Amino acid sequence: GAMNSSNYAELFNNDIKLFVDDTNVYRVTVHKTFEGNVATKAINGCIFTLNPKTGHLFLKIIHTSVWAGQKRLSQLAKWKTAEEVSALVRSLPKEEQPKQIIVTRKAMLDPLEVHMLDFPNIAIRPTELRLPFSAAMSIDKLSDVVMKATEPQMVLFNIYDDWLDRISSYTAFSRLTLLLRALKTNEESAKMILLSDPTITIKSYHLWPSFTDEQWITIESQMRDLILTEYGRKYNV
Amino acid sequence: MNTVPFTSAPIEVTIGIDQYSFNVKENQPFHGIKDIPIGHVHVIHFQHADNSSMRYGYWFDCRMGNFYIQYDPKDGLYKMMEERDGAKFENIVHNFKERQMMVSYPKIDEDDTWYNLTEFVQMDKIRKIVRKDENQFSYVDSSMTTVQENELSDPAHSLNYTVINFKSREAIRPGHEMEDFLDKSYYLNTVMLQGIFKNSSNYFGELQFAFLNAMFFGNYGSSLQWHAMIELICSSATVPKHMLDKLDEILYYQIKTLPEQYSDILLNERVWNICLYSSFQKNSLHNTEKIMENKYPELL
């Protein structure tokens, strides 16, 4: 059934699984028309499909052309997500196909289950975790490739960079969720923390700065401080 | 008019005949039911005074043979049986009628309730949902499971209803996933009506039979079947106008007949709210919507 704080370690066992987040698939700017009505303009989106054990990110870019002449776009977005995840699974060799797909939002369960009827052995599961995957478009290199796309495109990343050389996937996933939670709560403060010291750079083949183990502890500490403060502000406690 | 004679009533029992019911006392001089209208399917049903669990009964059509009831003290139930000796049967019934030991099927002349509940129900189709081919009548009870229940275990004693599953390859065309899931017209019209049922009469027949098994026996799998068959029509954008008009009449009489106190267990909130308020057919079931709103406004 659902994924929560009790069966949390299952993410790092040796059964292939993917998280799917659909929160950046359909993205709009809202604006005033000349007649003073309101209109949306869609911008490029992405499906965030992540192996939490390996860090392999299958970033399917959703080009605004997919919405042309379509109605009920928020509903179509869920089915377009299911269609692309399905196509991704079918493109993978059998031994690479996931045994489970965990959707970050319950509204994806029926679209994905119907698109995956051909895969009765792949469990489609919701989660009770409030995962901050929506903040993926606050990672500069992911935001850049989405906004520059002129056509549908799949781009492959490792969202852990080289971390697994030094830490376990459990620790890698906890670091990722803390960075993304920070970026989601206060993007500017989070990004200032990450890039303050210009001697720590981002390798061309990475998403995050090349921190030493000691500098990660300091960074991780600063992200927790950011998150607790904003929480006190939000809730005046 | 036909007669279902009884050998005797050795155990105290509530007897149902269609929508009617009578209390019979242990060893009461009861010899059965007369004046049964020819030309309809009938159900004769039983709840023992000592066991208000196991409602059970027999679907039958009087044109298909001479049927009687006899209590079996080994199996502990009222059994339907066929008498093949025509003269022996007429001779038994005439004696019991002369001695007035039979209750009369109590039809009011104005009253079309049973016809409206059984309009499309055909005894030949019932015998293919309940396969017991050595008998012309069909036994059903509270506990019998459906074929589809047995998938998710005795196949001979099961209800072989048409399997409906909205998240199935049968229901969903490859590459029409979203279209076919949000508009089930293709599953209704091509797969079910054209492919399996052949016509709307057989679809409505199984739907009406499922409802009656749910109401008379509290058969849970029958209730599931009745709701599935309603939900497939309400979830289809494209239904023939005559099917919607007839569906409205069918459901109206089912909701009218349902005991007021059984609405909590026999009616699925999600399906009815969908059919009446959310679905493509929200504006198409006027009679059904008026009676549901006036009789079970709580459920909605």
Coordinates of C-alpha atoms in Angstrom, one line a residue:
Chain A
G1 CA 0.0 0.0 0.0
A2 CA 1.1 3.6 0.8
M3 CA 4.7 4.6 1.6
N4 CA 5.4 6.4 5.0
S5 CA 8.0 7.0 7.8
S6 CA 7.7 3.3 9.0
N7 CA 8.5 1.5 5.7
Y8 CA 11.0 4.3 4.8
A9 CA 14.1 2.0 4.4
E10 CA 12.4 0.0 1.6
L11 CA 13.5 2.9 -0.8
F12 CA 17.2 1.7 -0.4
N13 CA 16.7 -2.1 -0.8
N14 CA 17.7 -3.9 -4.1
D15 CA 14.1 -3.9 -5.7
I16 CA 14.2 -1.4 -8.5
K17 CA 11.7 1.5 -7.8
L18 CA 11.0 4.9 -9.2
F19 CA 9.4 8.0 -7.6
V20 CA 7.2 9.9 -10.1
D21 CA 6.4 13.6 -9.3
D22 CA 4.0 15.4 -11.7
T23 CA 4.0 18.8 -10.0
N24 CA 6.1 20.6 -12.7
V25 CA 4.4 18.9 -15.8
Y26 CA 1.8 21.6 -16.4
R27 CA 3.2 25.1 -15.6
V28 CA 1.5 28.5 -16.4
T29 CA 2.1 32.2 -15.9
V30 CA -1.2 34.0 -15.2
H31 CA -1.6 37.5 -16.9
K32 CA -4.1 40.2 -17.7
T33 CA -5.4 40.4 -21.3
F34 CA -5.9 43.8 -23.1
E35 CA -9.7 43.6 -22.2
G36 CA -8.6 43.2 -18.5
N37 CA -9.6 39.5 -18.4
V38 CA -7.1 36.8 -17.1
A39 CA -5.3 34.3 -19.3
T40 CA -2.7 31.6 -18.7
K41 CA 0.4 31.1 -20.9
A42 CA 1.9 27.6 -20.4
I43 CA 5.7 27.3 -20.0
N44 CA 7.8 24.1 -20.5
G45 CA 7.4 21.5 -17.8
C46 CA 9.1 18.2 -16.7
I47 CA 8.2 14.8 -15.2
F48 CA 10.6 14.1 -12.3
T49 CA 11.2 10.3 -12.3
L50 CA 13.8 9.3 -9.8
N51 CA 15.5 6.0 -8.7
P52 CA 16.2 6.8 -5.0
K53 CA 18.8 4.0 -4.6
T54 CA 21.0 5.0 -7.7
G55 CA 20.1 8.7 -8.0
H56 CA 19.2 8.2 -11.7
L57 CA 16.8 11.0 -12.7
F58 CA 14.8 10.5 -16.0
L59 CA 13.8 14.1 -16.6
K60 CA 11.1 14.0 -19.4
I61 CA 10.8 17.6 -20.7
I62 CA 7.1 18.6 -21.5
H63 CA 7.2 21.1 -24.3
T64 CA 4.3 23.6 -24.4
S65 CA 3.3 22.3 -27.8
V66 CA 1.8 19.1 -26.1
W67 CA -1.0 21.4 -24.7
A68 CA -1.9 23.0 -28.1
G69 CA -5.7 22.8 -28.7
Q70 CA -6.2 20.6 -25.7
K71 CA -8.9 21.1 -23.0
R72 CA -8.8 20.3 -19.2
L73 CA -5.0 20.6 -19.1
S74 CA -4.6 19.9 -15.4
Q75 CA -6.4 16.6 -16.0
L76 CA -4.5 15.8 -19.3
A77 CA -1.2 16.5 -17.4
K78 CA -1.8 13.5 -15.1
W79 CA -2.5 11.2 -18.2
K80 CA 0.4 12.7 -20.2
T81 CA 2.6 11.9 -17.1
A82 CA 1.3 8.3 -17.0
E83 CA 1.8 7.9 -20.8
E84 CA 5.5 9.1 -20.6
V85 CA 6.2 7.0 -17.5
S86 CA 4.7 4.0 -19.3
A87 CA 6.7 4.7 -22.5
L88 CA 9.9 5.0 -20.3
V89 CA 9.3 1.6 -18.6
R90 CA 8.6 -0.1 -22.0
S91 CA 11.9 1.4 -23.4
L92 CA 13.9 -0.2 -20.5
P93 CA 15.2 -3.8 -20.7
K94 CA 13.2 -6.2 -18.5
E95 CA 15.9 -6.4 -15.8
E96 CA 16.0 -2.5 -15.5
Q97 CA 12.1 -2.1 -15.2
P98 CA 10.9 -1.0 -11.8
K99 CA 9.1 -3.5 -9.5
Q100 CA 7.3 -0.5 -7.9
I101 CA 6.4 3.1 -9.0
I102 CA 5.6 5.5 -6.1
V103 CA 3.6 8.6 -7.2
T104 CA 4.0 11.7 -5.0
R105 CA 0.3 12.7 -5.5
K106 CA -2.7 10.3 -5.2
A107 CA -4.3 11.8 -8.4
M108 CA -1.6 10.0 -10.4
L109 CA -2.7 6.5 -9.2
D110 CA -5.5 5.8 -11.6
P111 CA -3.8 7.4 -14.7
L112 CA -0.6 5.4 -14.1
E113 CA -2.5 2.1 -13.2
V114 CA -4.5 2.3 -16.5
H115 CA -1.4 3.2 -18.6
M116 CA 0.5 0.2 -16.9
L117 CA -2.2 -2.5 -17.3
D118 CA 0.3 -4.4 -19.5
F119 CA 2.6 -4.6 -16.4
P120 CA 0.4 -6.3 -13.8
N121 CA 3.6 -7.2 -11.8
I122 CA 4.6 -3.5 -11.3
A123 CA 3.0 -2.2 -8.1
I124 CA 1.7 1.4 -8.3
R125 CA 1.8 3.0 -4.8
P126 CA 1.0 6.4 -3.2
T127 CA 3.0 7.9 -0.3
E128 CA 2.1 9.8 2.9
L129 CA 5.6 11.5 2.8
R130 CA 5.5 15.2 1.8
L131 CA 8.4 14.9 -0.6
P132 CA 9.8 18.3 -1.8
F133 CA 10.3 17.2 -5.5
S134 CA 8.3 20.2 -6.7
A135 CA 11.5 22.3 -5.9
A136 CA 13.4 20.4 -8.7
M137 CA 13.0 23.5 -11.0
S138 CA 15.0 25.4 -8.3
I139 CA 18.1 23.4 -9.5
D140 CA 19.7 25.7 -12.1
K141 CA 20.9 23.1 -14.6
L142 CA 17.4 21.3 -14.5
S143 CA 15.5 24.6 -14.9
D144 CA 17.9 25.6 -17.8
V145 CA 17.4 22.4 -19.9
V146 CA 13.6 22.6 -19.4
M147 CA 13.3 26.3 -20.4
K148 CA 15.6 25.9 -23.4
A149 CA 13.8 22.8 -24.9
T150 CA 12.2 23.6 -28.3
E151 CA 10.8 20.0 -28.6
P152 CA 9.9 17.0 -26.4
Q153 CA 13.1 15.6 -24.9
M154 CA 14.3 13.1 -22.3
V155 CA 17.5 14.1 -20.3
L156 CA 19.2 11.8 -17.9
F157 CA 20.9 13.0 -14.7
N158 CA 22.3 11.6 -11.5
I159 CA 20.7 13.9 -8.8
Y160 CA 23.3 12.6 -6.3
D161 CA 26.4 13.7 -8.4
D162 CA 29.2 11.5 -7.1
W163 CA 27.9 11.3 -3.4
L164 CA 27.4 7.5 -3.5
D165 CA 31.3 7.2 -3.8
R166 CA 31.4 8.4 -0.1
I167 CA 27.9 8.0 1.5
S168 CA 25.0 5.4 1.4
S169 CA 21.8 6.0 -0.7
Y170 CA 19.9 6.5 2.6
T171 CA 22.2 9.4 3.5
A172 CA 22.2 10.7 -0.2
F173 CA 18.4 10.7 -0.3
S174 CA 18.2 12.5 3.2
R175 CA 20.7 15.2 1.9
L176 CA 18.7 15.6 -1.4
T177 CA 15.3 16.0 0.5
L178 CA 16.9 18.5 2.9
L179 CA 18.4 20.6 0.0
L180 CA 15.0 20.5 -1.9
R181 CA 12.9 21.2 1.3
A182 CA 15.2 24.3 1.9
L183 CA 14.9 25.5 -1.8
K184 CA 11.1 25.0 -1.5
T185 CA 10.7 27.0 1.8
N186 CA 13.1 29.9 0.8
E187 CA 14.7 29.6 -2.7
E188 CA 16.9 32.8 -2.4
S189 CA 18.3 31.9 1.2
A190 CA 18.8 28.3 0.1
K191 CA 20.7 29.2 -3.1
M192 CA 22.7 31.9 -1.2
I193 CA 23.8 29.1 1.3
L194 CA 24.9 26.8 -1.6
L195 CA 26.9 29.4 -3.7
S196 CA 28.2 32.0 -1.1
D197 CA 31.9 30.8 -1.3
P198 CA 33.0 31.1 -5.0
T199 CA 36.0 28.7 -4.4
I200 CA 33.4 25.8 -4.2
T201 CA 32.2 25.3 -7.8
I202 CA 29.8 22.9 -9.6
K203 CA 31.6 20.4 -11.9
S204 CA 30.3 20.6 -15.6
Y205 CA 28.9 17.0 -15.1
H206 CA 27.2 17.8 -11.7
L207 CA 24.2 19.7 -10.4
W208 CA 25.5 20.5 -6.8
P209 CA 28.8 22.1 -5.6
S210 CA 31.9 19.9 -5.0
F211 CA 31.7 20.2 -1.1
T212 CA 34.2 18.2 1.1
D213 CA 32.5 16.0 3.8
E214 CA 33.2 18.8 6.4
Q215 CA 31.7 21.5 4.1
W216 CA 28.5 19.2 3.6
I217 CA 28.0 19.1 7.4
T218 CA 28.2 22.9 7.5
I219 CA 25.9 23.3 4.5
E220 CA 23.4 20.6 5.8
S221 CA 23.4 22.5 9.2
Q222 CA 22.7 25.9 7.5
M223 CA 19.8 24.3 5.5
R224 CA 18.2 23.0 8.8
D225 CA 18.5 26.5 10.4
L226 CA 16.8 28.0 7.3
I227 CA 14.0 25.5 7.4
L228 CA 13.2 25.9 11.2
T229 CA 13.3 29.8 11.1
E230 CA 10.9 30.0 8.1
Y231 CA 8.7 27.5 10.1
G232 CA 8.6 29.9 13.1
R233 CA 7.8 32.8 10.8
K234 CA 5.1 30.8 8.9
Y235 CA 3.4 29.8 12.2
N236 CA 4.5 32.7 14.6
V237 CA 6.0 30.2 17.2
Chain B
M1 CA -52.6 -18.9 -13.2
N2 CA -50.1 -21.5 -11.8
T3 CA -49.5 -23.1 -8.4
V4 CA -46.4 -24.1 -6.4
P5 CA -47.7 -26.7 -4.0
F6 CA -45.8 -27.6 -0.7
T7 CA -45.6 -31.2 0.7
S8 CA -45.8 -29.6 4.2
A9 CA -44.2 -26.8 6.4
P10 CA -42.3 -28.8 9.1
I11 CA -40.3 -25.7 10.3
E12 CA -41.4 -22.2 11.0
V13 CA -40.3 -20.0 8.1
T14 CA -41.0 -16.6 6.4
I15 CA -41.9 -17.4 2.8
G16 CA -41.4 -14.8 0.0
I17 CA -43.1 -14.9 -3.3
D18 CA -41.7 -12.1 -5.5
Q19 CA -42.2 -8.9 -3.5
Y20 CA -44.7 -10.5 -1.1
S21 CA -44.0 -12.5 2.1
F22 CA -46.0 -14.6 4.6
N23 CA -45.1 -16.1 8.1
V24 CA -45.7 -19.9 8.3
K25 CA -45.6 -21.6 11.8
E26 CA -43.9 -25.0 12.6
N27 CA -46.3 -27.8 11.3
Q28 CA -48.9 -25.2 10.1
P29 CA -51.3 -26.9 7.6
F30 CA -49.7 -25.0 4.6
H31 CA -49.8 -26.5 1.1
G32 CA -48.4 -23.7 -1.0
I33 CA -49.1 -20.7 -3.4
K34 CA -51.8 -20.5 -6.1
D35 CA -52.9 -17.8 -8.7
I36 CA -49.2 -17.1 -9.7
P37 CA -49.3 -15.0 -12.8
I38 CA -48.1 -16.9 -15.9
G39 CA -45.7 -15.0 -18.2
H40 CA -43.2 -13.6 -15.6
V41 CA -40.2 -15.2 -13.9
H42 CA -40.8 -15.7 -10.2
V43 CA -38.7 -16.2 -7.1
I44 CA -39.9 -18.2 -4.1
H45 CA -37.6 -17.5 -1.0
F46 CA -37.2 -18.5 2.6
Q47 CA -35.8 -17.3 5.9
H48 CA -36.1 -19.8 8.8
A49 CA -37.4 -18.4 12.1
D50 CA -34.5 -20.2 14.0
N51 CA -31.8 -18.8 11.6
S52 CA -32.4 -15.2 10.3
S53 CA -29.0 -15.9 8.4
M54 CA -29.2 -17.8 5.0
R55 CA -32.0 -16.2 3.0
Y56 CA -32.3 -18.7 0.1
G57 CA -34.6 -19.2 -2.9
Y58 CA -35.6 -20.4 -6.3
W59 CA -36.0 -18.5 -9.6
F60 CA -38.6 -20.3 -11.8
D61 CA -41.0 -19.9 -14.7
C62 CA -44.3 -21.9 -14.5
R63 CA -44.4 -22.3 -18.3
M64 CA -41.2 -24.5 -18.0
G65 CA -42.8 -27.3 -15.8
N66 CA -44.7 -28.3 -12.7
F67 CA -42.7 -27.3 -9.6
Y68 CA -43.3 -27.9 -5.9
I69 CA -41.5 -27.4 -2.5
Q70 CA -40.7 -30.1 0.0
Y71 CA -38.7 -29.7 3.2
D72 CA -35.5 -31.9 3.3
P73 CA -34.8 -32.7 7.0
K74 CA -31.2 -33.9 6.1
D75 CA -30.1 -30.7 4.2
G76 CA -32.4 -28.6 6.4
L77 CA -34.0 -26.5 3.7
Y78 CA -37.1 -26.1 1.6
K79 CA -36.2 -27.7 -1.8
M80 CA -37.8 -26.9 -5.1
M81 CA -38.5 -30.0 -7.2
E82 CA -40.1 -30.9 -10.6
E83 CA -43.0 -33.3 -10.8
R84 CA -42.9 -34.8 -14.4
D85 CA -46.2 -36.8 -13.9
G86 CA -48.7 -34.1 -15.1
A87 CA -51.8 -36.0 -13.8
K88 CA -50.3 -36.7 -10.3
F89 CA -49.5 -32.9 -10.1
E90 CA -53.0 -31.6 -11.2
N91 CA -54.5 -34.2 -8.8
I92 CA -52.4 -33.0 -5.9
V93 CA -53.0 -29.2 -6.6
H94 CA -56.9 -29.7 -7.0
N95 CA -57.1 -31.5 -3.6
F96 CA -55.1 -28.7 -1.8
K97 CA -57.2 -26.0 -3.5
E98 CA -60.5 -27.8 -2.6
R99 CA -59.3 -27.9 1.1
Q100 CA -58.1 -24.2 0.8
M101 CA -54.7 -24.9 2.2
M102 CA -53.0 -22.5 -0.3
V103 CA -52.2 -18.8 -0.1
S104 CA -53.1 -16.7 -3.1
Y105 CA -50.4 -14.7 -5.0
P106 CA -51.9 -11.3 -3.8
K107 CA -51.6 -9.2 -7.1
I108 CA -53.5 -5.8 -7.1
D109 CA -54.9 -5.2 -10.7
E110 CA -53.4 -1.7 -11.0
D111 CA -50.0 -2.9 -9.7
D112 CA -47.2 -3.4 -12.4
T113 CA -44.4 -3.5 -9.8
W114 CA -43.3 -7.1 -10.5
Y115 CA -43.4 -6.7 -14.3
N116 CA -41.4 -3.4 -14.0
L117 CA -38.8 -5.2 -11.8
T118 CA -38.5 -8.2 -14.1
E119 CA -39.3 -6.7 -17.6
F120 CA -36.0 -8.0 -19.2
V121 CA -35.4 -11.0 -16.9
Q122 CA -35.5 -14.3 -18.9
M123 CA -35.3 -17.7 -17.1
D124 CA -33.1 -19.1 -19.9
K125 CA -30.4 -16.4 -19.1
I126 CA -30.6 -17.0 -15.3
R127 CA -29.7 -20.7 -15.9
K128 CA -26.4 -19.4 -17.5
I129 CA -25.6 -17.1 -14.5
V130 CA -26.5 -20.1 -12.1
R131 CA -25.3 -23.3 -13.9
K132 CA -27.3 -26.3 -12.5
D133 CA -28.5 -27.6 -15.9
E134 CA -30.3 -30.8 -14.4
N135 CA -32.9 -28.3 -13.0
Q136 CA -35.3 -25.8 -14.8
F137 CA -35.3 -23.6 -11.7
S138 CA -32.2 -21.8 -10.2
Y139 CA -31.2 -21.7 -6.4
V140 CA -29.6 -18.5 -5.0
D141 CA -28.7 -17.6 -1.4
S142 CA -27.1 -14.8 0.7
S143 CA -23.6 -16.3 0.8
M144 CA -23.1 -17.4 -2.9
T145 CA -20.1 -15.6 -4.4
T146 CA -19.7 -14.3 -8.0
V147 CA -17.2 -15.6 -10.6
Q148 CA -15.3 -12.2 -10.3
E149 CA -15.2 -12.5 -6.5
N150 CA -13.7 -16.1 -6.9
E151 CA -10.9 -14.4 -9.1
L152 CA -9.8 -11.8 -6.4
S153 CA -13.9 -20.9 -4.4
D154 CA -16.6 -23.5 -5.5
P155 CA -17.3 -22.7 -9.2
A156 CA -20.5 -24.9 -9.5
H157 CA -22.3 -22.9 -6.6
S158 CA -21.4 -19.4 -7.9
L159 CA -23.1 -16.5 -9.6
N160 CA -21.6 -16.3 -13.2
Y161 CA -22.4 -12.5 -13.7
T162 CA -20.7 -10.8 -16.7
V163 CA -17.3 -9.5 -15.4
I164 CA -17.0 -5.7 -15.5
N165 CA -13.7 -4.2 -14.5
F166 CA -13.0 -0.5 -15.4
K167 CA -9.2 -1.0 -15.0
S168 CA -8.8 -3.9 -17.4
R169 CA -7.4 -4.4 -20.9
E170 CA -11.0 -5.4 -21.8
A171 CA -12.2 -1.9 -20.8
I172 CA -9.2 0.1 -22.1
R173 CA -8.0 0.2 -25.7
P174 CA -4.2 0.6 -26.1
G175 CA -3.4 4.3 -26.8
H176 CA -7.0 5.4 -25.8
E177 CA -6.2 5.0 -22.0
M178 CA -7.4 8.4 -20.9
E179 CA -10.3 8.6 -23.4
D180 CA -11.7 5.1 -22.6
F181 CA -11.3 5.5 -18.7
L182 CA -13.1 8.9 -18.6
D183 CA -15.7 7.9 -21.3
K184 CA -16.6 4.2 -21.1
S185 CA -18.8 4.4 -24.3
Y186 CA -16.5 1.9 -26.2
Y187 CA -16.6 -0.6 -23.3
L188 CA -20.4 -0.2 -23.0
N189 CA -21.4 -0.1 -26.7
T190 CA -18.7 -2.3 -28.5
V191 CA -17.3 -4.7 -25.8
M192 CA -20.4 -5.2 -23.7
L193 CA -23.6 -4.5 -25.8
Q194 CA -22.4 -5.5 -29.3
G195 CA -19.8 -8.1 -28.1
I196 CA -21.2 -10.0 -25.0
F197 CA -24.9 -9.1 -24.3
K198 CA -25.8 -8.7 -28.1
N199 CA -28.6 -6.2 -27.1
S200 CA -29.7 -3.7 -24.3
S201 CA -32.5 -6.2 -23.3
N202 CA -30.0 -8.9 -22.1
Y203 CA -27.9 -6.1 -20.4
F204 CA -31.0 -4.8 -18.5
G205 CA -32.0 -8.5 -17.8
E206 CA -28.7 -9.2 -15.9
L207 CA -28.8 -5.7 -14.2
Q208 CA -32.5 -6.4 -13.0
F209 CA -31.5 -10.0 -11.8
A210 CA -28.5 -8.7 -9.9
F211 CA -30.7 -6.1 -8.1
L212 CA -33.3 -8.7 -7.1
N213 CA -30.6 -11.1 -5.8
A214 CA -29.2 -8.2 -3.7
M215 CA -32.6 -7.2 -2.4
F216 CA -34.1 -10.6 -1.7
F217 CA -31.0 -12.5 -0.5
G218 CA -28.7 -9.5 0.7
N219 CA -26.2 -11.1 -1.8
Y220 CA -23.3 -8.7 -1.7
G221 CA -21.7 -9.8 -5.0
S222 CA -25.1 -9.2 -6.7
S223 CA -25.2 -5.6 -5.2
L224 CA -21.6 -5.0 -6.6
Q225 CA -22.8 -6.3 -10.1
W226 CA -26.0 -4.1 -10.1
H227 CA -23.9 -1.0 -9.3
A228 CA -21.1 -1.9 -11.8
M229 CA -23.8 -2.2 -14.6
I230 CA -25.4 1.2 -13.6
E231 CA -21.9 2.9 -13.4
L232 CA -20.8 1.7 -16.9
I233 CA -23.9 3.4 -18.5
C234 CA -23.6 6.6 -16.3
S235 CA -19.9 6.8 -17.2
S236 CA -20.5 6.5 -21.0
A237 CA -21.0 9.8 -22.9
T238 CA -22.7 8.0 -25.8
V239 CA -25.7 5.8 -24.9
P240 CA -28.7 5.2 -27.2
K241 CA -31.6 7.5 -26.1
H242 CA -34.0 4.5 -25.6
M243 CA -31.5 2.8 -23.2
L244 CA -31.3 5.9 -21.0
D245 CA -35.1 6.3 -21.0
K246 CA -35.6 2.6 -20.1
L247 CA -32.7 2.7 -17.5
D248 CA -34.5 5.6 -15.8
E249 CA -37.7 3.5 -15.5
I250 CA -35.8 0.4 -14.3
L251 CA -33.9 2.2 -11.5
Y252 CA -37.1 4.2 -10.5
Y253 CA -39.0 0.9 -9.8
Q254 CA -35.9 -0.6 -8.0
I255 CA -35.5 2.4 -5.7
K256 CA -39.3 2.5 -5.2
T257 CA -39.3 -1.2 -4.1
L258 CA -36.1 -1.2 -1.9
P259 CA -37.0 -1.5 1.8
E260 CA -36.5 2.0 3.4
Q261 CA -34.2 0.5 6.2
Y262 CA -31.8 -1.3 3.7
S263 CA -30.6 1.9 1.8
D264 CA -27.5 2.1 4.1
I265 CA -26.1 -1.4 2.9
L266 CA -27.8 -1.9 -0.6
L267 CA -26.9 1.6 -2.1
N268 CA -23.4 2.7 -3.0
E269 CA -23.1 6.5 -2.3
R270 CA -20.2 7.0 -4.8
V271 CA -22.0 5.3 -7.8
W272 CA -25.4 7.2 -7.2
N273 CA -23.8 10.7 -6.6
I274 CA -21.7 10.0 -9.8
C275 CA -24.8 8.9 -11.9
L276 CA -27.2 11.7 -10.6
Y277 CA -24.7 14.7 -10.2
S278 CA -21.2 14.2 -11.8
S279 CA -21.6 11.8 -14.8
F280 CA -22.5 12.3 -18.4
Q281 CA -26.0 11.1 -17.6
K282 CA -26.6 13.6 -14.6
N283 CA -29.4 15.2 -16.6
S284 CA -30.9 11.9 -18.1
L285 CA -32.4 10.0 -15.1
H286 CA -35.2 12.4 -14.1
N287 CA -37.5 9.8 -12.5
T288 CA -34.7 8.0 -10.7
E289 CA -33.2 11.4 -9.5
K290 CA -36.7 12.6 -8.2
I291 CA -37.4 9.4 -6.2
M292 CA -33.8 9.1 -4.8
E293 CA -33.9 12.8 -3.6
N294 CA -37.4 12.4 -2.0
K295 CA -36.7 8.9 -0.4
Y296 CA -32.9 8.9 0.4
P297 CA -31.7 12.5 0.4
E298 CA -29.4 11.5 3.3
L299 CA -27.3 9.1 1.1
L300 CA -26.6 12.1 -1.3

